[PDB]
Amino acid sequence: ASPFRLASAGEISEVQGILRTAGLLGPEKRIAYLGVLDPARGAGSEAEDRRFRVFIHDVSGARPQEVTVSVTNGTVISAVELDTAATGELPVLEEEFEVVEQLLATDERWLKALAARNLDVSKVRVAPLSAGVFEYAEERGRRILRGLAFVQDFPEDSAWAHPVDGLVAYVDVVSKEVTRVIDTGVFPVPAEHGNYTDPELTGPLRTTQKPISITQPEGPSFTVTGGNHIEWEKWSLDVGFDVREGVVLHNIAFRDGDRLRPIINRASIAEMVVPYGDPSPIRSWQNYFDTGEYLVGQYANSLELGCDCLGDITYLSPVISDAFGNPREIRNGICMHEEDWGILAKHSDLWSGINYTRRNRRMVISFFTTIGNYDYGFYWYLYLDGTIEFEAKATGVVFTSAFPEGGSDNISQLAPGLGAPFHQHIFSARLDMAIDGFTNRVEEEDVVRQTMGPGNERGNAFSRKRTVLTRESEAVREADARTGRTWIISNPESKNRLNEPVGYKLHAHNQPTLLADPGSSIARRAAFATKDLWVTRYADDERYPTGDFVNQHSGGAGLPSYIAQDRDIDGQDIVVWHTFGLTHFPRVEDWPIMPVDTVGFKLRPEGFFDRSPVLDVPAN
Amino acid sequence: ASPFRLASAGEISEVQGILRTAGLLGPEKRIAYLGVLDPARGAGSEAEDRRFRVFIHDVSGARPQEVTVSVTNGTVISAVELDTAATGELPVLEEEFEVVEQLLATDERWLKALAARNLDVSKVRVAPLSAGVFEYAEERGRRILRGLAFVQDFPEDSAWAHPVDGLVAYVDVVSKEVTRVIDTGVFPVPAEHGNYTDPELTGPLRTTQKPISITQPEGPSFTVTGGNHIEWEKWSLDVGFDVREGVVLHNIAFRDGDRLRPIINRASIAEMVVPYGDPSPIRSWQNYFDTGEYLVGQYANSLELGCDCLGDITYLSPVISDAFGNPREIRNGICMHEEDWGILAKHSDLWSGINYTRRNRRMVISFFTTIGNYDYGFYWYLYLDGTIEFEAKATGVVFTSAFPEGGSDNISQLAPGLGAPFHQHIFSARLDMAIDGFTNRVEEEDVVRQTMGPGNERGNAFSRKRTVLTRESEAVREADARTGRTWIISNPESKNRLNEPVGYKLHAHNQPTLLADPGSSIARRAAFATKDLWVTRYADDERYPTGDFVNQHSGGAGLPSYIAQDRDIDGQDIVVWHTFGLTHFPRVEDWPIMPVDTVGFKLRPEGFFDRSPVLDVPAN
Ligand SMILES: OCCc1ccccc1
Ligand SMILES: OCCc1ccccc1
Ligand SMILES: [Cu+2]
Ligand SMILES: [Cu+2]
Ligand code: NA
Ligand code: NA
Ligand code: NA
Numbered sequence A, B: 001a002s003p004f005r006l007a008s009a010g011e012i013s014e015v016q017g018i019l020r021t022a023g024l025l026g027p028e029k030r031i032a033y034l035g036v037l038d039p040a041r042g043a044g045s046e047a048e049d050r051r052f053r054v055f056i057h058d059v060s061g062a063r064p065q066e067v068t069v070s071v072t073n074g075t076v077i078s079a080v081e082l083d084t085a086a087t088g089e090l091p092v093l094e095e096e097f098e099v100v101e102q103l104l105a106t107d108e109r110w111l112k113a114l115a116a117r118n119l120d121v122s123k124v125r126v127a128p129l130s131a132g133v134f135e136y137a138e139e140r141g142r143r144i145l146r147g148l149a150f151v152q153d154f155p156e157d158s159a160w161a162h163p164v165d166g167l168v169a170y171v172d173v174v175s176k177e178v179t180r181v182i183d184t185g186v187f188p189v190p191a192e193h194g195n196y197t198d199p200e201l202t203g204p205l206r207t208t209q210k211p212i213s214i215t216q217p218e219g220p221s222f223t224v225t226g227g228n229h230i231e232w233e234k235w236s237l238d239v240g241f242d243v244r245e246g247v248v249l250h251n252i253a254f255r256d257g258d259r260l261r262p263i264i265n266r267a268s269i270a271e272m273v274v275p276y277g278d279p280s281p282i283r284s285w286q287n288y289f290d291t292g293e294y295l296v297g298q299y300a301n302s303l304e305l306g307c308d309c310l311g312d313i314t315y316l317s318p319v320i321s322d323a324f325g326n327p328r329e330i331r332n333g334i335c336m337h338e339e340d341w342g343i344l345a346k347h348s349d350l351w352s353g354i355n356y357t358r359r360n361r362r363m364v365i366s367f368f369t370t371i372g373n374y375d376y377g378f379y380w381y382l383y384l385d386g387t388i389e390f391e392a393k394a395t396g397v398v399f400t401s402a403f404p405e406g407g408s409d410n411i412s413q414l415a416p417g418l419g420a421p422f423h424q425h426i427f428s429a430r431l432d433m434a435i436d437g438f439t440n441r442v443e444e445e446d447v448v449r450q451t452m453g454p455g456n457e458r459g460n461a462f463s464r465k466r467t468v469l470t471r472e473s474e475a476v477r478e479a480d481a482r483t484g485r486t487w488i489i490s491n492p493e494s495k496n497r498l499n500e501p502v503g504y505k506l507h508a509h510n511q512p513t514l515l516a517d518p519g520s521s522i523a524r525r526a527a528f529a530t531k532d533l534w535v536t537r538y539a540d541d542e543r544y545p546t547g548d549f550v551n552q553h554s555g556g557a558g559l560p561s562y563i564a565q566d567r568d569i570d571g572q573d574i575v576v577w578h579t580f581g582l583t584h585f586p587r588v589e590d591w592p593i594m595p596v597d598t599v600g601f602k603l604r605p606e607g608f609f610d611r612s613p614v615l616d617v618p619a620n
């Protein structure tokens, strides 16, 4: 019955049929994005209407369409022809990944460049890289991909070990025209292989690792009902899946006594971007938005037991659309399980003689995705004590280049002649807040140091200050680690027993934000990435910090546009957008496959409860 | 045979006998600190000499002594009478914890103050709080404790729920004189109990938690030999225990092919301090150094299976001295085990078709200690990929006060009339570095942003810079989270295959450092806490950032004195001192017993290896 249930195969087939019948899904059409739309606000009316949003691409060169359909009524709600030079190109298709290599393989400029380097064209792989927006006039309104080459010596060879530097090409994937081929000069192609399964490279595998067994003889402490509704240790939520954002959490709430108390209405990673910091023309254009341009959900991995998720696991197998509207299941694409988390609370008291120890645990909801060379794990955690946390785990193979003779200020060396250009991985968490309901506000909290003097004669005092963010214009905030800056989301109309408004405190990692010059294309296209925290007023159509159509969009889209409305956010339905990321100067240890590195954020209750919420946890 | 073996009961008995025979341990003497001394530098001579350092207190008012003895030769190496007004008082004795309450119970001023508040003296507990150094002339050279009162309604009652504000007393624990009683006025004593085991407060315990079983059917992957030598997944180290610092790690090294490569010679938490930020005279003097003043090792908990350490556990049971020189075992005081740590490395490659997943694990060495109201877990982690990490877990019961009518800028409210003064918990990690040997240097690494212009026409470039710290005078460093500041410890004489010096990168959490005004007593006594990173030249007698005798020391001791020597640290035997801590504005959820909060740091290899060190990890 739940309006937050996962999309079904049947629903996806209905969308296909509705689209087909309406004349919108002929043979030259491709579905570039398809997702179910969340229930609308003020929906306490009881009138379920399952709607899906679709981006439809045309391979024959006709303009694409944005379409919303109702799978309840079988109707097309809206169908709008898009002007891509205006509002952006559609997300990259998986079926386009091979096109760049294929178009270049018969191009004389490209073959010439390969020939100079003595590379058999049959062995040259070409990365299908998003183009962004730079100085090339002919690219406006064209569906462009850029291509960088990597040699693959044999079918099972890791191409990333063999970048072809000094060469890049641009292709119109629709007209099938190679628009430009740029050769700045030959660089040696790194010769060492990067094959991390080769005994030559790995050496003899370890025999020292003894097994670790994690089991639950009574089964899990959480229940799953209605397909995706989770209940666990007072927590309640719905686990959604969208082909763009991946795992999405809905209706995060905590059972406090008799009350079901909302905390976050919707939590997602609404964008991620990987900007490169190498000023070489071969790569200075490169900034892929894995979420917005490539859609990380469609590449979610099937997670295998004992390997990806250890212990007592419950899987969801979300259904997506293929490029033709057929339902495709990602089997075991989402892991759900609880983990022991060490000590929760502990005290041995010298006066009462009481010794007390309780253990902690967390509910984990996760998926792993792959987009070319890079692979990410996305993890949401719910803790017994009311803490909510997200963690991204970055791994895969680093994007490579030549390492210049004489070195580089913007590239690191991984192996002889093999380079790794500097880059960032920057995420945006979109948190549709609902602290005890929708009437919320955000305060910026700073530590306040105090001067020695009257009222502080020993110079020991320190304090804190809170600044309420009242309007969107003043809600674009930056980190200040030195002054312990956090942000509190509170409900001014809902007070705890000490008569203070209930709250949750956001703790950032205070990692560097976007490093690019503010006049850069990427600073404009990824403006969200330039500040740590944004607060907006909720709106149905404000979904992504980068706007709906990120691919080849000229800039200013998303958050910087939304906040221009300068709406009231002081005791209103608001959305917090947190930017957090990793700045990556690759190390030799990252090669030839990268050990996981992590980044994320958490929120902890701040006077949300009237006392510790874990006093009723048993002794074990 | 190892010179790094744990102290034995027999060794401690030898120290007692040697001290007794030398006339240094008569009936009025107490051992305030006893610990074994690490092997000296340049010790490739093969001549074991187990030495112990002892601080000896006298309860009759005679001056204390610092004594070093050899348990090999049975000799007193040195015995020096201390002038405590000059160099500081000795650490607080456990047997002194009860003295403050006992002395005050027959004092007329104290009884008067209690009587005004209608508190039965039999029910009033008094915290034995370190005194620090302020304006009280009579305190120089006196062994003083300050006392704050808490009512305990019955034997098993949590006194912390019932602070007696507006009252503090000072006592000379040797002369048994109450020097001052200060009553600034009556505050209501908070009436609600804080008994977290009471069904009235906890409510019905949860029945929803299903068991989680962690077992190793083949046993652990690490070996323990020689009592405390650990070998695990290429790691090698010795686990020490000192009554002051607690668990200490020695000779951390990594087996890389045929080579045993040193990384850290000695790792410890060499000090921790908890400064309070309430300008009330009742508490404005309060800054306890749990390590330096109280000795956290002597209060290490006996850790029980299934409760404190879950899984396949191997315990050490370290031996310490009691106040009379008798050996006392802390049974199961140290936990050692390996934990699964999720995904280590993962890639599904679109061109090779190879799907690859490896799991991570970490070796954990930990202990838990209790000092009055507060309890801490100290955890060291070694990861498969070469990462070293420390984590402190803070729990117990928060130090309480009245909550002022009309509120407070320096105290938070936990319950009706119950306050929690603002404070910090600040740690100093002392890392005696040995990156591939003792010839080390430290660089400060900052991200460098670049301006759009010639050579960076698209404004996308960013870089990094490194600054070698050459002399101690310039090695006092502060965090800069905004510019991604880290510190690299390298060996300029040991290069990897790409001909770069091998290194390890320190990643700080960039939490606020000491907040007190720089003119404060605590800023002088805890100068280390005012900066994130110090580098010194190794010296035998430079052990603690606060000096040897922290209790009632007037200031300037430790690091600020050491760095005055302005020694060469560029390619030399050096020691890194990292300050990291939590700034605590207590929340209602922290009451009546605090959920664990954490803080720490890590180091990751930075071109230490010639490629990823975990390519030989099996597939599971
Ligand atoms: O991450 C998306 C960019 C990318 C896509 C395919 C191959 C390499 C890189
Ligand atoms: O943490 C050391 C200070 C302290 C000691 C004993 C009781 C309360 C506080
Ligand atoms: Cu990276
Ligand atoms: Cu605290
Ligand atoms: Na445009
Ligand atoms: Na909201
Ligand atoms: Na002095």
Ligand code: NA
Binding pocket: B265, B432, B433, B434, B438, B538, B572, B573, B574, B575
């Ligand atoms: Na050293």
